[PDB]
From Swiss-Prot:
Organism: Saccharomyces cerevisiae (strain ATCC 204508 / S288c) (Baker's yeast)
Subcellular location: Vacuole membrane; Cytoplasm, Cell cortex; Endoplasmic reticulum membrane; Cytoplasmic vesicle, Autophagosome membrane
Protein name: Vacuolar transporter chaperone complex subunit 4
A GO CC term attached to the entry: autophagosome membrane
Similarity field: Belongs to the VTC4 family.
Triggers of expression: By low phosphate.
Binding site for Mn(2+): 232
Amino acid sequence: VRQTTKYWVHPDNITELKLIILKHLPVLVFNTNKEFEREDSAITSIYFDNENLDLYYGRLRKDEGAEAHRLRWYGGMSTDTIFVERKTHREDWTGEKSVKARFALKERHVNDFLKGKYTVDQVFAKMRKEGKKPMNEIENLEALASEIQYVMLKKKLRPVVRSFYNRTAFQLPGDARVRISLDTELTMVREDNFDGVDRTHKNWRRTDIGVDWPFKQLDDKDICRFPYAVLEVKLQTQLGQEPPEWVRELVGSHLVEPVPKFSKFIHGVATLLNDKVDSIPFWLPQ
Ligand SMILES: [Mn+2]
Ligand code: NA
């Protein structure tokens, strides 16, 4: 039985919270000399929606099967691998869950793929020729890309909001019973053209910013700098036990404020496009 919960952490409690967590878990690193640079912690996602904000309202209401679509990259602007991600809301007898699916795309193919000029077959031609990944897994990836490309074209999606943050991952590899992520420098940026300003110049992302937080070059109206860190806890507790004593104590501690349905996508749209949306998540006024 796996649970996921989200919390806001005041800047005054970030360090104290870090010290607690690191008592129990390692931090993941991705360079072999175990050294890291500022940009290594960067995660950037470009969320797509259409002008009616269909996907936003779907996610807000938690419609069954409501999709969010985002193009994400890790690290700095030299990163060439772009993950095309689809997150799907599920509900049934057992309760709720989130289903994530993605496939990887070279940056230079992104625009062409989103316009349906670069086909899914063309997208995976090199992967098939290689013969490294099993055929069925490839077929299932292709099916995902076709579904995503279809919705992007059918629903006329375009870039709407960017989320940026630095993420620390606390995790003892080979033990997913407990996984914790702390997100700082959380920022949402406008990518839409709803006020007539062609922010991306028809690219899939703005190019007038990189990962250079705090992004002082942005107009005030194009950016929301989030005051708190966001803590996410991913539990896999072996039935029928309870979560570890240190985890349960933490979440209930004054250090963190639970915000059940929090979503960077929803927060960004509602804050940045506040005059446009007709419904607002419940962590915001009305
Ligand atoms: Mn999350
Ligand atoms: Na490229």
